[PDB]
Design a protein around this ligand. Structure first.
Ligand SMILES: Nc1nc(=O)c2c(CCc3ccc(C(=O)N[C@@H](/C=C/C(=O)O)C(=O)O)cc3)c[nH]c2[nH]1
Ligand SMILES: NCC(=O)N[C@@H]1O[C@H](COP(=O)([O-])[O-])[C@@H](O)[C@H]1O
Length: 200
């Protein structure tokens, strides 16, 4: 399966994805990395790995749909089958999400449906849960509401901050996101026509 990874920031999840695709038994290959921002740390990881990079600055396009089309064009250029959102902070338009429905994955630093949004760790600490985690899910039009593929629970220790908690959760992210990508790219896991998750 041909995979595109969309980034906006650091990209440690990108690196974990890259490493798992170098495995001989991997069903996925990362053929292109796309960042909506220029000169972010993810582009260098992709260039160090030997993966083509393209920058599509959304602050240089008419609106959402137009900018999504510029991404879609690059995905078609590299014949992409699967899209991975690795810290990609742009809400994707209706038609884009619908075209790549059941073919686009995202990592979220909480045990969904708990703590949807931009600051899951902050929410988790404010609420006072002792167990949080991370979720890999198919991207639906509604934010963080797509079908769940994999989840891993991560303990919250007393005195935790966003710095320490995210550090611990990211260790789980680096596990389940490559694992989920493999499940999808191998055809083991797919989006069911009923809407739900289908195994084989
Ligand atoms: N349809 C759809 N569903 C999704 O789940 C999804 C995702 C997954 C995670 C996500 C969800 C919302 C925002 C988000 O709202 N970001 C806002 C602010 C970011 C910033 O200021 O940097 C934004 O829309 O720009 C950023 C990231 C990315 N794009 C998506 N598209
Ligand atoms: N879009 C939802 C969201 O909050 N994404 C979060 O951004 C980080 C990117 O890490 P990385 O840049 O080191 O891969 C990840 O930890 C992920 O949970």
């Amino acid at each position: 399966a041909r995979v595109a990874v969309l980034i906006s920031g650091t990209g440690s999840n990108l690196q974990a994805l890259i490493d798992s695709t170098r495995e001989p038994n991997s069903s996925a290959q990362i053929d292109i990395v796309i960042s909506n921002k220029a000169a972010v740390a993810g582009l260098d990881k992709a260039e160090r790995a030997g993966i083509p990079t393209r920058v599509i600055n959304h602050k240089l396009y008419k609106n959402r749909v137009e900018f999504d089309s510029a991404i879609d064009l690059v995905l078609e250029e590299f014949s992409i089958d699967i899209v991975c959102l690795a810290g990609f902070m742009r809400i994707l338009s209706g038609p884009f999400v619908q075209k790549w429905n059941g073919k686009m994955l995202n990592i979220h630093p909480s045990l969904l449906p708990s703590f949807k949004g931009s600051n899951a760790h902050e929410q988790a600490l404010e609420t006072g849960v002792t167990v949080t985690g991370c979720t890999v899910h198919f991207v639906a039009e509604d934010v963080d509401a797509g079908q769940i593929i994999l989840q891993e629970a991560v303990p919250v220790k007393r005195g935790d901050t966003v710095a320490t908690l995210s550090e611990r959760v990211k260790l789980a992210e680096h596990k389940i996101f490559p694992a989920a990508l493999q499940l999808v790219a191998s055809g083991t896991v797919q989006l069911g026509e009923n809407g739900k998750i289908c195994w084989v």
